Amino acid sequence: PKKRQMEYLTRGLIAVQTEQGVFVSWRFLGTDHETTAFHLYRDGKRITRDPIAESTNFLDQNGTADSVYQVAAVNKGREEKLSKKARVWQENVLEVPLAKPEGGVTPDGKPYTYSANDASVGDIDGDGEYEMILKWDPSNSKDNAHDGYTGEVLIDAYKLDGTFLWRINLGRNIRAGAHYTQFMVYDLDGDGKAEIAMKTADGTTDGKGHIIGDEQADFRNEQGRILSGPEYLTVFKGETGEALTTVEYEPPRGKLEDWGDGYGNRMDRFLAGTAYLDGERPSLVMARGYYTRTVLVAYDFRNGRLKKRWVFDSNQPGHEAYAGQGNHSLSVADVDGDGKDEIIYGAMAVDHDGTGLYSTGLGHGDAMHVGDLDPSRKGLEVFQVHEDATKPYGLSLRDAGTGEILWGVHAGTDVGRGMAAHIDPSYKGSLVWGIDPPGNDGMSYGLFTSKGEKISDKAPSSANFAIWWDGDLVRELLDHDWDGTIGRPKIEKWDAENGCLKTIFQPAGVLSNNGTKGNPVLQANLFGDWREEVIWRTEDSSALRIYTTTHLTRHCFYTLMHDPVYRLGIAWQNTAYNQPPHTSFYLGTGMKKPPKPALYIAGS
Template sequence: MSSITRSVSAGVALATGVSLALAGVSVPAMARGPVPGAAAPLGGVQLEHLDRGLVAAATPEGVFLSWRLTATDATGATADGLTGTDFTVYRDGEPIATVTDSTNFLDTAVTTEETAADARYAVVAVVDGTEVERSAEVAPWTQAYTDLPLTRPADGVTPAGEAYTYSANDMSVGDVDGDGSYEYFVKWYPSNAKDVSQVGYTGNTYIDTYAADGRLLSRIDLGVNIRSGAHYTQFMVSDFDGDGRSEMMLKTAPGTRTTTYAAGGEVASESFVTLPEADLDAGVTNADDYRLDADAYYEHVVGMFRGWQDHPEVAAGNWPATLGEAFGIPQRYDYPLSDADARALADYFMDDYAPSRSARNNLRAFEGFVVDGPEYLSVFEGASGAELETIPYEPGRGDDGLLWGDYAMARIEPGNRVDRFLAGVAYLDGEHPSAVFARGYYTRATVVAYTWDGERLTQDWNVDSGHVPMDNPFDASPHGGVGSDDEYGTLAGQGFHSLSAADVDDDGRQEIVYGSATIDDDGSLLYSSADTLPAGSAAPGTEAKLGHGDALHVGDMDPDRPGREIFTVHEGATGAPYGWSMRDAATGEVLFGGYTGKDTGRGMVGDTDATVRGLENWAVGLRSASGELLPGRAPGTNMSIRWAADGTTQLVNGTGDQDTTIDDARRGRLLTATGTRTNNGTKGNPALVADVLGDWREELLVRTADSSAIRIFTSTEVTDRKLYTLMHDPQYRAEIARQNTAYNQPAYTGFYLASDTDFSEVSVPEAFLPGALPALRRQLEQLIGAGGVSGPAAQQLRASLDQAQRAIERDQAGNAARAVEKFLDRLGRQKPGTVTDSARDRLGHAGSVILSMLS
């Protein structure tokens, strides 16, 4: 069993029903192990302390209610779900139902819209017949969705005079204020956002943070030196430093600016990112504009040619000594080139050589790219957007793509392969979230991992395949080659348009699945997958890497074989052994797959048919988890969603000006989200698919057609499956954080989740929730204010919690546990009248959960 999870069938590590007998008063508690030594570090996988996330929605059948079970609520399993905390449903202050087998309920007594509008609902957690926690009251939505209002940025005009507008794009979530509910991060795309290979200016990219009521908390303007497109900006949201509040980490540049807004919507502050001292000394300012117009790019090429003989690859004899040799023309010039000769060669290169390679090469029109200037990695406070630290982005681009192969192929695309970025969040040590940032995957591939301790970024490790050697940077085929690094060279060319974090080897620590290769938690190369090219390929019988692809899925797809699987599609055509493949995630060995001889661009997995064992997969045909070809047509491949009551998988569809839909392979259309749009062109991605509210099923978050709001849809199918929120599964939480990376991919849990899940095999994390203790302190203050705790008891209980918080901030689990024990002891010893029975039950339960985590 992994060190960060437990199976509910393997003994109950967090069993309720135990009491601490304190001065004759029974305080509900959680069973725990021995208290660690005073200075022992905190243990357990760090996850968010979440409230119940109660949602009520009016339906024709009644008011549907849905809420969260947390990982710390789970104690065991039945055939239909987990056991643990039960719930009482309240309407207008009166109990109307007790729910033990799920975390949803349909109130059929309220069926008219007028009655539903006046109703107020709450759920109360019940442990051993005692009410220990009450949710906030909610009013029903009038339909199965709610709108998150947005504040759209102003339109703009490029230096070329082209007007552009904005629409909402990818999203993420995080608890930025530690109150147990999510805030929403929204990326704004200009209408002229472009792929890395497309020429032209783009507008600025913005990242907004919104409270759940639509109040704009902050806006980060990435500035003119970060181009807008699917491959440039991934924003990682997580509580990286374990203070119970989320931060955001992303790539920035000179000119990146934060605006913080006050409660009334007015600007509270504005500031640019802090430029490193070395850049300030070099004269860099936040007013710099590194975008190239066509004339500036021409001068860039002239400068590159004038220094040709000094390029390290030329000096080492790896590249042609002259440009004439590189272009295959007679040698006419002496080196170093004069300005006139360099211009003559630049003219030849742009007007003759490049067009001869491809009719699409029009380098005279090359503009809008950033191929020079500083690049940064910045950490921002989630709530205010305030910059916390900025460091140089690693690795730097080095050049405009010459070494990366951007001039080597028939299509000459400066700034393309060099500017392919990826990012993710991973529990590399099994407990704390690290941020992972990457550059490159077609040729050179680099991956860097960081931890953030609240004050400084620390690099965990740096993986670099090295550039793929070329004998001529203007005429070569570097795709599929091996990088120059002895250890990581085979990583080159294996990356995808996304990455995943998953514990593929079951050692309790997550690895980085980098497309067709996997990097171990310590930064070593676990494997790089290759196989034999088949008949009909470019070189039958030879070995080739599986190579690059567009779609990547990692999870437990086959419950009848141990471990996890990786399903991918590949675009290497006749140079790749497979167009699609299913691999063993631990070894990279191909379990089954198919050669296609072409770019296989799409693929998906999911439990679309409950009669078939495991998760089905489809790219070319529909197959079972074991590879058996199944009858029927394959569903869509844009995005999946867990929407149904029976645990099957549904598909999200809709591109362009079509309404977004949720479709079931067996039942047909389940939802038409009228007036909404997906993102990213033909990719048809929702803004986000994640379990952000209600029970374990996922919500659909999509923009309205005019981007005035994000519309959040929740499933109102009543389910009898009881499962903790997917956001408390470490793999799923990491996958949600990286969903906005390049070609958005679905998130998968670390355990098998389907219509036939054996709940006794569901892994439950041994979690540490940094926000739990502050939440207990807020609960105490509320009870003091309401009279539930009074007299000397108030200060005594405060003092114990303060002591526990100081110990946690010093990473001292034992001292924190002893302080919480003191809190529970004091709670049990209070004189009658100073702590009400209800307050004692609630505070005692919350304190016992925390003590169990610390122990």
Template sequence: MTPSMSRRLVTGGICSTMLLTALVGTGANAAPAQAEPAPVPQLEHLDRGLVAATTDDGVYLSWRLLAGEVTGADADRQHGPEFVVSRDGEPIATVTDSTNLLDPNGTETSTYTVSTAVDGRTVSTSDEVMPWAQGHYDLPLNRPEGGVTPAGESYTYSANDMSVGDVDGDGEYEYIVKWDPSNSKDVSQVGYTGPVYLDAYELDGTQLWRLDLGPNIRAGAHYTQFLVYDFDGDGRSEVMLKTAPGTSTTSHTADGAGQAEYISMPAEDVQAGYSHDDYRLSAEDYYEHVVEMFQGWTEHPEVVAGSWPATLEEAFGIEPRYDYPLSAADARELADYFIDVYAPSRSERNQLRDFEGFVLSGPEYLTVFDGATGAELDTVRYQPGRHDDGLMWGDYAMSRIEPGNRVDRFLSGVAYLDGTHPSAVFARGYYTRSTIATYDWDGESIQQQWLVDSGWTPMSNPFDDSPHGVDGTDPEYGSITTQGFHSLSAADVDGDGRHEIIYGSATIDDDGSLLYSSFDTLPEESADPGAEARLGHGDAMHVTDIDPNRPGLEIYTVHEGAAWAPYGYALRDAATGEVLYGAYSGQDTGRGMVGDVDRTTPGLETWAWDLRSADGALLADAAPGTNQSIHWAADGSTQQVHGAQEETPTIEDWENGTLLVAEGTRTNNDTKGNPSLVADIFGDWREELLVRTGDSDAIRIYLSTEVTDMALTTLMHDVQYRAEVARQQTAYNQPSWPSYYLASDMDVRDVPTPAVWLPGALEDLATAVDSAIAAGQVDRPAAAQLGNAVSAAQRHLDAGRHEQAARAADRFVRALERSIDKGWLSADAAARLGYLIQGLGQR
């Protein structure tokens, strides 16, 4: 390799001074920049992701094209290095136009590797793999033992939602599995639940740890939203989620499970008398809770302010009969009236004598755990706290009285608010008071960035009012009430390189300010013709480039507001919230989806009850399924995952029928019919299907084995898609969408070359330097300069000093250029080190 060839590799990498400054910000002693560099997001350093599967026609192989490897594109593919495929140690093909291959001579006992070649020189080689049988692989699980609730009800466990992250920095994903008990509940459903568990596994089934959320976190889709992500940029994923007293972790080793350790409680909580006890209420406990609430009625701030009725009799609409403040005996009489007479008169479903199993008091925390060991790293208070049992949240105001409902609706996600570093997003409430908090993890402590809070929705009577669709008291954020969904997304909607948080029918800018909250006019057939109303709450939301003929991204949503909502479904401009098209339904429109299902029509189609083109034209009165989508076919089109409850899951193509029957497996979350995960975790840009086996003894991973000539970087190196995968497990699981138009008619030249920072690649670079030195491929002056620079970069990165790490990596680039010029490296070493420094990322 000539010096000029090697220099092209080096200078094509991410480690130029200007770009490194963009990664970490400008330090106090840095020279002033001529212009603010574009943000460069930090993502995972992944290995080749080679996977093989036996088919009727031979062995199918698929591998990743990584962000730092892209050198250009044509209409059908992104270009990168040559890939040399070897079977049983012997080269069988050199692939330059895709990232997959069908080997007709392969067998189930064959072994394969893929090597990366630059100018004919091998610069990396994948781990060796053997083919999966029948196009799938079973990841063994350790199913928890069942139990019995305080009410004497037995329960068992099934694997539920999943997420992935590289918890140990080896370039391979580990698998985080949530276990739900058979008595898992919706927040509106009464009763005890068993505890929720989170497990971490290697692909071979080695269990790393188990997290027991304990009795004070209920089991259900709305309670436990867990984020698996490398938040601090050390190349290893953490796990962050809401916890409570009683939460504990157990590490697993080759010698068996370790000792369970409770999370730490703040000293003030311990001093206040809290412990790791069970704070769930029995029916008797709840009755006493109501008595106590009634005794303190005259001291409630809303009563003191004159906003609520001065007496409970006035609130219930009965004749006055008691003196206030209430005595214990009078409070019990009113509690009996409320529970036995008033509540059932509002709805026959209000059976509050049976109200049990809820956690309405006690501390609430946010904890970050080490992804490799499960060890607690930091715990802070969950913000905002519940405040009360839902009284202020409107849980007693509707006809269905549901303590602990609106107050305990949680969401989570990941957003690159500065364009570079991932932040955790946790939300509470979305029907009435609506809150969104963002956090950073720097390797030592959790730091809250900002908190959006709509304020309370005013009520004239907390026992008889309509708090939905009412502005909160906050002057900036009051309009986001009732706009949140059962999920959220993060995307760069305004083109500034930073993520906004799409909170259903409202969008929060990267700095925490309100970008917009979408309203429109109610039509003639609605409940209030001509009135301006929120688009409002819904269950399903999709954010991506739906219409490639328009600039920017679009948002497709469905809405529950029935006669009080302007639309049953709507497509909006993501930057402004303007409705591009939609239709009034007058009923709760529960499901909706987008995707390229009609290959003859440009853009992604949208559907709720009929199939529409990206510009709103009616294509068909019927529509595909809406449980989950998957990119499975070779041409970039979109398929659907069918099957809920005890149905066998299938992958369906709207035009070509059934593509896969996942025999022996099941989906999750009752009628939602969600797989445990759909994500691009192996191989080329297509997504894998991860579903539990019927007995939950394994997660079965299905791989598409249709040969494709489309070549794209792994979807996990698109920053929007990677963040979407992290939030896919949240509440009502929604598909993960990239930041660009992905469809059968896409022009790959329109796909942006990923500009990313992959700090985990430093470890591979350090290993390569040591190997080259040991092999005598590096002369002494270069060995000292290269070794010192890469060691310093890794040391600073491990300590969370990103700016210093970036400067050290920049020194490595200069040393490598100098070593090439001086002839201090062999041609092989120059090629390999140049390729690896490029692998840190690319403009």
């Protein structure tokens, strides 16, 4: 296999106080050998005798609040350089204080405030530790079709120690809302440091205070929309937030009505992804449209410049059937076995070279999941739900590479949420299900194996994120309890024996994001072992709280950020209606040994 550019990562050693001792976990790196084992040191002294070789975690019954840990890789009996010293966290929470921006007033005299919203991660300085890239959302942010002015969108960078690095202000000409700004954080050129790409406009102010274009320009109409004036695409330096290059946004508006309405409702439907279109280095993919005209534009970033790679446009001859298929998210994976990434754009797919891969014709939906959902069947599968009541299926399971529909279930109505996850150890692969979102009819559309066997008419009442949280191979479920105004985050576990969800984590003082959608700020394997961390905002957005597991595992996996599908999932997590990340391999009961990551480290 081709070796993919990936991020340098430190051991990511953490230590957390529990009632039974100090829980320690660290990364198994893509550069480690399958036979690599580990020694642990507490207060300078080795506390392991036999190197730890079956996991990258440890419960130290002799650890105290004052203990300091280091880990060393061991290969062929030879021990390597010890990690940085890790101190013991008092709780399984790392709190990152925020510089909460002050609210304001829109032109119509209506006040707004800010809350901490979607995030992404990138290593902006190349030291092997992630920084947080955080989007602030004003309290007046808008669904496209709802009129009204919005507060300016702000994007911040923070170090995990709470250091505020910079703020980008997108300015008055970028409307706030789920479907507008899609911020892509990645080391696009391979120097070892992440940059940030997003759509910008006249009046966007970068991290060093430099304004893009005309500072005086105001393209907001009486309804608070921006439907005129230049549109730009900017790559910002990770370290400083400074604009590196700005180009014209593609595709341009053209005649408004050609998108299907004159209000920009369909036109201003943006998505973004990072994809290894050559199977070796990342490319940037900025997308516009899914209900009607659908356009994906690929770029390569090198030596301070964006260069257009290709354009997929449903208006192109032979591509008409590709319109109306995109979801409020996209997925990225090598689905056809050529080593190169394809874009799974909801109910259709675009090949690595920008040609049409397939269109299912099943139409736009609000959730999708690409992974090895049926490990008995060669290749990846796509499970998704569908919104159009007139279409054949409310939920569909297909071959990811050919688009062949393996099975589907008719609904004759919008199926607004869906999940695919290994929640039942007695089925090798994912169960899949569809349910109504909160504040709707509370309907279930069934729980099925990925082969289409109906387990029950009543599906798990959570269909949002799935998260590896505890020690076992089953995936847990992340959602919230929505009360009509706010959501209280939770992680739940499926009880397959009696067909119910049990709450296993529900932290106080934090809120979910994006209304009924109930998103975390971010879910990602940020540090420690292969289990995933989760970030939620405090109620007042004075801080982010990053939660990490303290459940001991007997299982060992390479860090998920070194997985070619999972890492790209983190990059698109913020995109429109946030979707959860998946592994390129089947992780679950009865799994075969995963292949070691085929990679090289950017920046040597």
